[PDB]
Amino acid sequence: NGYTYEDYKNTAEWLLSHTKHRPQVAIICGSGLGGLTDKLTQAQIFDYSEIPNFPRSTVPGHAGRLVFGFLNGRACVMMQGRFHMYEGYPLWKVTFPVRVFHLLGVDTLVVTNAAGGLNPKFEVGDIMLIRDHINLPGFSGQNPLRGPNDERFGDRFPAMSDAYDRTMRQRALSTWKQMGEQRELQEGTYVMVAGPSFETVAECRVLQKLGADAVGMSTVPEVIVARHCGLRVFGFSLITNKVIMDYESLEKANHEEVLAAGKQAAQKLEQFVSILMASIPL
Amino acid sequence: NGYTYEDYKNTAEWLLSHTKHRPQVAIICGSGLGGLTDKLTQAQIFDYSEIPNFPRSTVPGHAGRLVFGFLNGRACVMMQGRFHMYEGYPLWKVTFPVRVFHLLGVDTLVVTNAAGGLNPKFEVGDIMLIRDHINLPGFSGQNPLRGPNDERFGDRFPAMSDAYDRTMRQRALSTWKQMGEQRELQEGTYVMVAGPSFETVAECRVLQKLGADAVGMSTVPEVIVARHCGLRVFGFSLITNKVIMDYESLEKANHEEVLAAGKQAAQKLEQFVSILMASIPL
Amino acid sequence: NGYTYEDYKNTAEWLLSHTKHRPQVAIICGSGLGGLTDKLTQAQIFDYSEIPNFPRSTVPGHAGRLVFGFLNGRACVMMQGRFHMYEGYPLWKVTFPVRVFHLLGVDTLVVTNAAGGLNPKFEVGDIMLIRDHINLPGFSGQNPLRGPNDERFGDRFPAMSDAYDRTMRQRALSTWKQMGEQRELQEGTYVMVAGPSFETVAECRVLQKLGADAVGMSTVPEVIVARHCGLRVFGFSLITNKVIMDYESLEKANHEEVLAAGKQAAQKLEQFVSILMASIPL
Ligand SMILES: O=c1[nH]cnc2c([C@@H]3N[C@H](CO)[C@@H](O)[C@H]3O)c[nH]c12
Ligand SMILES: O=c1[nH]cnc2c([C@@H]3N[C@H](CO)[C@@H](O)[C@H]3O)c[nH]c12
Numbered sequence A, B, C: 001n002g003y004t005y006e007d008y009k010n011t012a013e014w015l016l017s018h019t020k021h022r023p024q025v026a027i028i029c030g031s032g033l034g035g036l037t038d039k040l041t042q043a044q045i046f047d048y049s050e051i052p053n054f055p056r057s058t059v060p061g062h063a064g065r066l067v068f069g070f071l072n073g074r075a076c077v078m079m080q081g082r083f084h085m086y087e088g089y090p091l092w093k094v095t096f097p098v099r100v101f102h103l104l105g106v107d108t109l110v111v112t113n114a115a116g117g118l119n120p121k122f123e124v125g126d127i128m129l130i131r132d133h134i135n136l137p138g139f140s141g142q143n144p145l146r147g148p149n150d151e152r153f154g155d156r157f158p159a160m161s162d163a164y165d166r167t168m169r170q171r172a173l174s175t176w177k178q179m180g181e182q183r184e185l186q187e188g189t190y191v192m193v194a195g196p197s198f199e200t201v202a203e204c205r206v207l208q209k210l211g212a213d214a215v216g217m218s219t220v221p222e223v224i225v226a227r228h229c230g231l232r233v234f235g236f237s238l239i240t241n242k243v244i245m246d247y248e249s250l251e252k253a254n255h256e257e258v259l260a261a262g263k264q265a266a267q268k269l270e271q272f273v274s275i276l277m278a279s280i281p282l
């Protein structure tokens, strides 16, 4: 891990002394969900490039910014653009922000992402709640906590069986009903793979047998580092596409179909998030 | 990825200006199948050592050569000796040739390899056709496409559900009948593991439950980079041994038994490949 | 692999000329089982820090020592404190001792460790014998043998289906009866994951479906390098905790509960090991 404890501090202090805002909730906007930034009030923006020790984005969208502000009466801080393993970043870079948020005072993390549908009942547009995850990269060694443990942040062997806040999962289901949506809120397991290429048919079959409901290439590292931190954790997935599960098909997965899905569910996603802010205890 | 786009170009140009040949089909000869080199006509040889930017072979067989020529009226280019992950090479080295082939003008890749038999119906000598693969290393992070994407070669998130050419799979089955072989042509899923040690009994059981038919320690990376390239892809496996699946057994897997299998199926493999060349569209 | 063959030699020679002892059996004491060191007679201690080329322990317990001596009339050598992947060590460091033991003359390796219980019949305190393992990190690339093979130690593609000595497994069962323990000796498959965080519920379910009986974050690399060496291999697991397998639970895994388990089964573990020494042929 190239980051000493001081690096985390220095980044925190720099931000603390560059904004009067003091966030409680950190939000990581997944693919095509960055619109949430609009709903914040008194929004103060900071590009990653200007933030000391921040993994400088390669050439994805060049619009990696930390947007502070208030969302439904809640001191937030949003990441509009995130880092992934498939871009070449070591997991201690992918998750460097989460520890910065902690030192800033945040005590709750909301992670959102786009993912394929493994559960056959799911459908494009659906919003699966994350009850649990399967960290395939972690089994093999790729775990953000790898290396000497910094007791200052947390313990050597933190548990993950209680990763996703039960309360939040329950309160989010409520809010959804108090929205009268046709499609019932979904809930399940999120499996992470590194990507960047898409699953073959055989691969999807594996992921289903494993018991995964949806598949993405992010989130899990951030969640793990968060939990090791003491942060409360809630998150969901926007089922942007159903994974191909038969060879007699004539369909393929593509960034187009995925971004298009994000595009439509755009505002519906924002509403849901904004409202839920009221459920986060103080 | 240590290779810039220029490196690929320079290697391509060097080859282009060092041979009058202009290949359409690239062939990667798996373990003990390198004999195919004999069947080429007007065969021009190039050792990897002399080819700029080519991963220089460690000390496997020191006979890593790129052999250009014609095979059954088809401008080929064969790799007699390939690179593996277990030898320590990063996947962007293991698959550097595939992108060189592309810039040379190749538009079809034939991958062959030796592998164990997971499907219980399989037998030593069998020739399993590859319908699909399970990229275990990829799930964890080891994917040749890892790092910044070079739009010049392909997209950021390429699909793999349609990796192995349907047409070719069908036409290869034909050719086999027009050979009157006792054993029917086999077809199935190829699972990749990094090796270099062999699967335990428990491990084989896992691979079978995953739904894999055969297991090897190569190919998948090359296929992925190929598909990201637009190349058509066909490939097969020479079931050189049945994996041990019971503890009451008294059998072990070894390079001897594997090379011996390659040795007998040697010519039979060549015939099949050479003929199929006629099925590859122009 | 940062270690040349000379490095192994130099370390061996240094030890050979620093102790009159010449071990036959090497013992790797897992978590909370390091007490075995007491039972040795004519015990000569060597801290890792003083041993050339030895992976210098970071800041776990600072008590990494190689303790030579006799155990039940058997020239031993024990590792009180081991290296793990989650601490950041490359597997060729984690397993550097095993090859040092070989050059010292050892021909048998006993590996012990603490692990969670996947098999539902298991219970805290139980002692599962290792019949086989599932090397998840290995599938993805993390295999101690990765890189150029040193024929001097062993072959390029060693088998692992016969990793755990049948004889020993049988003789250990005997010894246990000749102990009249209430709980029958357990036996099964050990699955390795890198850690350092604990499995989620979904993760445990995966490991069970894979067919694993217990889960830990070590051992497998050492075993593999041992077998590639020609060493006989025996080992067991102290089921220190049952992994959480339902979401309706209110239990978590922690280093406290694990070390506490090691603490009670402490001596019972030693007795078993010490006695078994007599079963190891000469
Ligand atoms: O089916 C899928 N498999 C793997 N990742 C994704 C994604 C997520 N969307 C992004 C690619 O569009 C990528 O960042 C990935 O994490 C959507 N659908 C799938
Ligand atoms: O049962 C098997 N498991 C894993 N690899 C292989 C192979 C292939 N053959 C080579 C070892 O002989 C190695 O390069 C591997 O990719 C044959 N049989 C098996």
Ligand SMILES: O=c1[nH]cnc2c([C@@H]3N[C@H](CO)[C@@H](O)[C@H]3O)c[nH]c12
Residues within 6 Å of the ligand: A157, C031, C114, C115, C116, C117, C195, C198, C199, C215, C216, C217, C218, C240, C241, C243, C253, C254, C255, C258, C259
């Ligand atoms: O349930 C478990 N999962 C993964 N590792 C362990 C362990 C072993 N104990 C250590 C953590 O207490 C760690 O070194 C690990 O290898 C005990 N129980 C479990």
